[PDB]
Amino acid sequence: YVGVEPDANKLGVIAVAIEDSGAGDITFTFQTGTSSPKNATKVITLNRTADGVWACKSTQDPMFTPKGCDN
Amino acid sequence: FTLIELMIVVAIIGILAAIAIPQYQNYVARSEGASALATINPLKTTVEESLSRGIAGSKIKIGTTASTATET
Lengths: 71, 72
Prior knowledge:
This is part of a larger assembly, with two copies of chain A.
Chain A: E1 12-18, E2 24-30, E3 43-48, E4 54-58
Antiparallel strand pairs in A: 1-2, 2-3, 3-4
C-alpha cells in the first residue's frame, strides 16, 4: 500500500490496477471541480507492457503535454 | 441723482451683459466615460482568479451575498 491517498492531490484522482500477469496502468484523471477548464476531464496514463517496458500517454493538447510523453 | 450717472450705469450694465460662454458638454460626456471604465475594469481580476482557481463559470455573479468555496 503506497503511502498516498487516491485524492491526495486536489487537482485530480489517481487509479492503479496491476494485473496478475504484471501488466498494468497507473492513470491520473483531472477533476472538473478543481482543475482548469482546458485540463478538465483529461487523463494521463503510464502503462507497463507484459515483457516489462514502461510507456506513457495523455489526452491533453500538444502544447500542454509535458516533455516526456506523446498524445 | 442726475441723468449722467443713470445713463452711465445703464451703459455699463449692457456692456457687462456681453460675456461669451463656450461649450461645456463634451467635458461631462468624457468624464462619464472616464469613470465608467475605471469602475468596471477591475472585475477582470476577479474573473481571471475565479476561472484559474478551479470553479467554473456561470456561478460568477454580482452583488453582496458573501462568498464560499464554490461560488464567487
